[PDB]
Design a protein around this ligand. Sequence first.
Ligand SMILES: *[C@@H]1O[C@H](CO)[C@@H](O[C@@H]2O[C@H](CO)[C@@H](O[C@@H]3O[C@H](CO[C@H]4O[C@H](CO[C@H]5O[C@H](CO)[C@@H](O)[C@H](O)[C@@H]5O)[C@@H](O)[C@H](O[C@H]5O[C@H](CO)[C@@H](O)[C@H](O)[C@@H]5O)[C@@H]4O)[C@@H](O)[C@H](O[C@H]4O[C@H](CO[C@H]5O[C@H](CO)[C@@H](O)[C@H](O)[C@@H]5O)[C@@H](O)[C@H](O)[C@@H]4O[C@H]4O[C@H](CO)[C@@H](O)[C@H](O)[C@@H]4O[C@H]4O[C@H](CO)[C@@H](O)[C@H](O)[C@@H]4O)[C@@H]3O)[C@H](O)[C@H]2NC(C)=O)[C@H](O)[C@H]1NC(C)=O
Ligand SMILES: *[C@@H]1O[C@H](CO)[C@@H](O[C@@H]2O[C@H](CO)[C@@H](O[C@@H]3O[C@H](CO[C@H]4O[C@H](CO)[C@@H](O)[C@H](O[C@H]5O[C@H](CO)[C@@H](O)[C@H](O)[C@@H]5O)[C@@H]4O)[C@@H](O)[C@H](O[C@H]4O[C@H](CO)[C@@H](O)[C@H](O)[C@@H]4O[C@H]4O[C@H](CO)[C@@H](O)[C@H](O)[C@@H]4O[C@H]4O[C@H](CO)[C@@H](O)[C@H](O)[C@@H]4O)[C@@H]3O)[C@H](O)[C@H]2NC(C)=O)[C@H](O)[C@H]1NC(C)=O
Ligand SMILES: *[C@@H]1O[C@H](CO)[C@@H](O[C@@H]2O[C@H](CO)[C@@H](O[C@@H]3O[C@H](CO[C@H]4O[C@H](CO)[C@@H](O)[C@H](O[C@H]5O[C@H](CO)[C@@H](O)[C@H](O)[C@@H]5O)[C@@H]4O)[C@@H](O)[C@H](O[C@H]4O[C@H](CO)[C@@H](O)[C@H](O)[C@@H]4O)[C@@H]3O)[C@H](O)[C@H]2NC(C)=O)[C@H](O)[C@H]1NC(C)=O
Ligand SMILES: *[C@@H]1O[C@H](CO)[C@@H](O[C@@H]2O[C@H](CO)[C@@H](O)[C@H](O)[C@H]2NC(C)=O)[C@H](O)[C@H]1NC(C)=O
Ligand SMILES: *[C@@H]1O[C@H](CO)[C@@H](O)[C@H](O)[C@H]1NC(C)=O
Ligand SMILES: *[C@@H]1O[C@H](CO)[C@@H](O)[C@H](O)[C@H]1NC(C)=O
Ligand SMILES: *[C@H]1O[C@H](CO)[C@@H](O)[C@H](O)[C@@H]1O
Length: 549
Amino acid sequence: ANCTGSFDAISASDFVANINPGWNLGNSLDATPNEDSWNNPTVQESTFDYVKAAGFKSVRLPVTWTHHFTSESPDWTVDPKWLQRVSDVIDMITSRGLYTIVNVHHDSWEWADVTKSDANITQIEQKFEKLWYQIGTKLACKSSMVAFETINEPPCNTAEDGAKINKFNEIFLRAINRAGGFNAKRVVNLVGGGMDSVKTSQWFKTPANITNPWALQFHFYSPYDFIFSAWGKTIWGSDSDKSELDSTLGLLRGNFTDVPIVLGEFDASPTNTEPAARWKYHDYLIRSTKKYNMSPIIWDNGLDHLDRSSGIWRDPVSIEIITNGNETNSLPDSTVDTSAPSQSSSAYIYHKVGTEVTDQTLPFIFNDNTLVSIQDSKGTTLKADTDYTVSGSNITFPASFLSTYYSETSEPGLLPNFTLKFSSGASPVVQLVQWDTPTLSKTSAAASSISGSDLSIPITWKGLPKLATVKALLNNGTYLVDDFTQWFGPFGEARTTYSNQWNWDDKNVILTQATVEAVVAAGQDTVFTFEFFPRVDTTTNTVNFTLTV
Ligand SMILES: *[C@@H]1O[C@H](CO)[C@@H](O[C@@H]2O[C@H](CO)[C@@H](O[C@@H]3O[C@H](CO[C@H]4O[C@H](CO[C@H]5O[C@H](CO)[C@@H](O)[C@H](O)[C@@H]5O)[C@@H](O)[C@H](O[C@H]5O[C@H](CO)[C@@H](O)[C@H](O)[C@@H]5O)[C@@H]4O)[C@@H](O)[C@H](O[C@H]4O[C@H](CO[C@H]5O[C@H](CO)[C@@H](O)[C@H](O)[C@@H]5O)[C@@H](O)[C@H](O)[C@@H]4O[C@H]4O[C@H](CO)[C@@H](O)[C@H](O)[C@@H]4O[C@H]4O[C@H](CO)[C@@H](O)[C@H](O)[C@@H]4O)[C@@H]3O)[C@H](O)[C@H]2NC(C)=O)[C@H](O)[C@H]1NC(C)=O
Ligand SMILES: *[C@@H]1O[C@H](CO)[C@@H](O[C@@H]2O[C@H](CO)[C@@H](O[C@@H]3O[C@H](CO[C@H]4O[C@H](CO)[C@@H](O)[C@H](O[C@H]5O[C@H](CO)[C@@H](O)[C@H](O)[C@@H]5O)[C@@H]4O)[C@@H](O)[C@H](O[C@H]4O[C@H](CO)[C@@H](O)[C@H](O)[C@@H]4O[C@H]4O[C@H](CO)[C@@H](O)[C@H](O)[C@@H]4O[C@H]4O[C@H](CO)[C@@H](O)[C@H](O)[C@@H]4O)[C@@H]3O)[C@H](O)[C@H]2NC(C)=O)[C@H](O)[C@H]1NC(C)=O
Ligand SMILES: *[C@@H]1O[C@H](CO)[C@@H](O[C@@H]2O[C@H](CO)[C@@H](O[C@@H]3O[C@H](CO[C@H]4O[C@H](CO)[C@@H](O)[C@H](O[C@H]5O[C@H](CO)[C@@H](O)[C@H](O)[C@@H]5O)[C@@H]4O)[C@@H](O)[C@H](O[C@H]4O[C@H](CO)[C@@H](O)[C@H](O)[C@@H]4O)[C@@H]3O)[C@H](O)[C@H]2NC(C)=O)[C@H](O)[C@H]1NC(C)=O
Ligand SMILES: *[C@@H]1O[C@H](CO)[C@@H](O[C@@H]2O[C@H](CO)[C@@H](O)[C@H](O)[C@H]2NC(C)=O)[C@H](O)[C@H]1NC(C)=O
Ligand SMILES: *[C@@H]1O[C@H](CO)[C@@H](O)[C@H](O)[C@H]1NC(C)=O
Ligand SMILES: *[C@@H]1O[C@H](CO)[C@@H](O)[C@H](O)[C@H]1NC(C)=O
Ligand SMILES: *[C@H]1O[C@H](CO)[C@@H](O)[C@H](O)[C@@H]1O
């Protein structure tokens, strides 16, 4: 390959500084078999106008190559139309002034999984080398704003696996260097096992005689329970929560003291996480990437953050937090005690149908900013000292003001919200919610009658149309799954896990087919308690469904 442009060489350190912060074009070129095969339509270039406008400096471009080969051994030819598609999307990004990182993505487990017992490691190496030679050839003449990343989250359980991941980095470096063009001075992102901080620290080794400018990329989706909505965890922000996060990043940095580091994916998704906890978490994560000189890139699958059809960011507070890391954020406080028998959140003003409208006081973590103004979502700035007062860290809304937004009898649902403008940092949003205890169309079912598939139960949402968690208890008191949640306090004991065991959609709460098969195996009627926000206690805002055996 021969290039006719110029190339502005950049060090890995300067590249990693320049890309902070990044955003992922998730579930697109990484979707299988085609870019519109999952939830997102065909990629359109205005999507990158929105990303640029929000303050991101870079776009990570996950690409899954598995379903775009037109031959197998020994050439492993990639469809030139797919290589052209990847090339053109990269051009969409860099022509708007955004840096790019492009990779090999779900290939990692679809065919390149070195941990499977039947894996032919020779063929994996061979196909991987051909793939990166062809990618590197097609992309050889891209500017220095385009970096290459070895492979996404490669499955890796043992040090023997970790040597094979090191070999991936070497095969990759050799392929792109033979491809030529500008690749010898192109910034690259090398990877460790599962892209996990500990596996990387344990087994990653710099490729001998490396000459590309290089950075290490890892992903961070901890703590599991909050990020994946496991075991009823719906809070984040205690001293130990922060210590676990700060430690995980610091032990990684402590093993790679002079290596530029890219945090290539993270996300407390607005779809499943509670906002006040989510904002404390994103705030603390950004603070920690700044402590340990890491550049973060948020994961967004198309439904998490940006709506690409409208340009609306579903969670504007998180985006502000991530794109303005030099600024201190004032945040709504929230319960962070797992032993607390009630959970509160200053990201919300909650009112129950059929109760009187009362004053509501929301504690905030001001972090030495001042409150400048508040504005509702209809465009009205509220009147300070009439519509709200400030006392210390507390923001109080009087009952007479709130009674202009809801009453004892108005319908349950989402009402206007309030955007709080502070001296500096992000502008948090307080969502008014009129809520009641949801009802279900059905209260029991035989498990035998409804197996082979998920169980969808129609529901009348009354307030937030989201599920917080599901408790599952056999008739004799044994937990349906995961006995160890008995140590997780009043809101965690006997609770089950999002997507694995339960879900929800617009009209239904859902028990998965695996959940149903667990009941049949237990041989015992099981009570499912669907639990909703607010989590004022363990029973009030909840409804039961019994699977019979
Ligand atoms: C969705 O479904 C779930 C599951 O079906 C529903 O949950 C269930 O709700 C019912 C109803 O609320 C609960 O019943 C209560 O149980 C109380 C004891 O609970 C504890 O023990 C049980 C049993 O444990 C054994 O069995 C299990 C097998 O499953 C074994 O594993 C275990 O080892 C034991 O062997 C436990 O199951 C229970 O666990 C739950 O809670 C713990 C604690 O957090 C959780 O960790 C668990 O995960 C689980 O969630 C717990 O360990 C029992 O005390 C209580 O009986 C009193 O109250 C009754 C109702 O009183 C109200 O109504 C009356 C009018 O009818 C009013 O007068 C009254 O004031 C009140 O308003 C009374 O009818 C009854 O007589 C008892 O009254 C006494 O106590 C009252 C409360 O103080 C007093 O007000 C009374 O005056 C009276 O006091 C007098 O008597 C006592 C005792 O004699 C004296 O001490 C006292 O001094 C005084 O003289 C009730 O039976 C059930 O526990 C719960 N089950 C589960 C699994 O959660 C859920 O509601 C539903 N949700 C929805 C939204 O629909
Ligand atoms: C505070 O309160 C605020 C006020 O209530 C609240 O704001 C609301 O926030 C929600 C969520 O962020 C917004 O909902 C989205 O609305 C999108 C459409 O918006 C346009 O049309 C609306 C109706 O007329 C207008 O209200 C809106 O006007 C506003 O915005 C303009 C742009 O700034 C502005 O110019 C206007 O003046 C005005 O300010 C706008 O014109 C809608 O597209 C979006 O739906 C997607 O996301 C849902 C999940 O949130 C999905 O369920 C849904 O299916 C859509 O996702 C699909 O499409 C995506 C894009 O392609 C894909 O990536 C997805 O995967 C998914 O794909 C499926 O469907 C495709 C077909 O569509 C198909 O191709 C795929 O195969 C797949 O099947 C969402 O509903 C709402 O607009 C906001 N309201 C207002 C008034 O602003 C705010 O959230 C509150 N703040 C906080 C912090 O709580
Ligand atoms: C670089 O990255 C690595 C990987 O993350 C970091 O190493 C890890 O550090 C943490 C914190 O110091 C360690 O956690 C502790 O683990 C001990 C048990 O350690 C023993 O068992 C391990 C399991 O196989 C083994 O890996 C260890 O081997 C190391 O240590 C020996 C002896 O020093 C040494 O000879 C080896 O060569 C290895 O270096 C070891 O044999 C456990 O007892 C601890 O519990 C205490 O602390 C926690 C902290 O909160 C507390 O909660 C408990 O109550 C208890 O008080 C603790 O969990 C982890 O084991 C280390 N992992 C490895 C593989 O070494 C390393 O710190 C990073 N370096 C820098 C500079 O940041
Ligand atoms: C902020 O708001 C909380 C809640 O109203 C206040 O805490 C309460 O203080 C009174 C004492 O005046 C106690 O009786 C309550 O039990 C407290 N409630 C709690 C701790 O949840 C707090 O004082 C307020 N701070 C201000 C106004 O500066
Ligand atoms: C593994 O694949 C290579 C290349 O496709 C092939 O030559 C080799 O014989 C295979 N080995 C086994 C054990 O199947
Ligand atoms: C409850 O029933 C399950 C059903 O398999 C059984 O495994 C468990 O031992 C039982 N526990 C008690 C306390 O009865
Ligand atoms: C969370 O904190 C609030 C404080 O406003 C309480 O009212 C609630 O019961 C929970 O403790």
